[PDB]
């Protein structure tokens, strides 16, 4: 029924290792380019 | 700067500006320290200008 079964599981193992490498790095890029904004402070200067 | 004799100005500085302070009075030299540069942005927003 599934002649591709072992090749599918090998490609899935490569997929799992590559995704476990790639997800924290892309998340780190997002955290960098958004950490320019997430540390931002706002002030208000009403003249009274 | 200008039409002034250097020896005349030295005589004047010896006469007047002798003994200005010369003494730290606590042996405490105020020394300058290198300052950290910060890549940063400041945005003062007033749209009425």
Curated annotation (Swiss-Prot), chain A:
The protein's role, per its UniProt record: Component of the ubiquinol-cytochrome c oxidoreductase, a multisubunit transmembrane complex that is part of the mitochondrial electron transport chain which drives oxidative phosphorylation.
Membrane-traversing stretches: 11-31
Residues of the full protein shown: 278 to 325 of 325
Protein known as: Cytochrome c1, heme protein, mitochondrial
Upper classification of the organism: Eukaryota, Metazoa, Chordata, Craniata, Vertebrata
Family the UniProt entry places it in: Belongs to the cytochrome c family.
Subunit structure, interactors included: Component of the ubiquinol-cytochrome c oxidoreductase (cytochrome b-c1 complex, complex III, CIII), a multisubunit enzyme composed of 11 subunits. The complex is composed of 3 respiratory subunits cytochrome b, cytochrome c1 and Rieske protein UQCRFS1, 2 core protein subunits UQCRC1/QCR1 and UQCRC2/QCR2, and 6 low-molecular weight protein subunits UQCRH/QCR6, UQCRB/QCR7, UQCRQ/QCR8, UQCR10/QCR9, UQCR11/QCR10 and subunit 9, the cleavage product of Rieske protein UQCRFS1.
Compartments in which it is found: Mitochondrion inner membrane
Mitochondrial matrix side: 32-48
UniProtKB/Swiss-Prot annotation, chain B:
Modified-residue entries (N6-acetyllysine), positions: 15
Tissue specificity annotation: Expressed in neurons and astrocytes of the cerebral cortex and hippocampus (at protein level).
Signal peptide residue numbers: none
Disrupted gene: phenotype observed: Results in early embryonic lethality.
Domain of life, per lineage: Eukaryota
Compartments where found: Mitochondrion inner membrane
Record-stated family: Belongs to the peptidase M16 family. UQCRC1/QCR1 subfamily.
Assembly behavior: Component of the ubiquinol-cytochrome c oxidoreductase (cytochrome b-c1 complex, complex III, CIII), a multisubunit enzyme composed of 11 subunits. The complex is composed of 3 respiratory subunits cytochrome b, cytochrome c1 and Rieske protein UQCRFS1, 2 core protein subunits UQCRC1/QCR1 and UQCRC2/QCR2, and 6 low-molecular weight protein subunits UQCRH/QCR6, UQCRB/QCR7, UQCRQ/QCR8, UQCR10/QCR9, UQCR11/QCR10 and subunit 9, the cleavage product of Rieske protein UQCRFS1.
Function description: Component of the ubiquinol-cytochrome c oxidoreductase, a multisubunit transmembrane complex that is part of the mitochondrial electron transport chain which drives oxidative phosphorylation.
Protein name: Cytochrome b-c1 complex subunit 1, mitochondrial
Residues represented out of the complete protein: 234 to 282 of 480
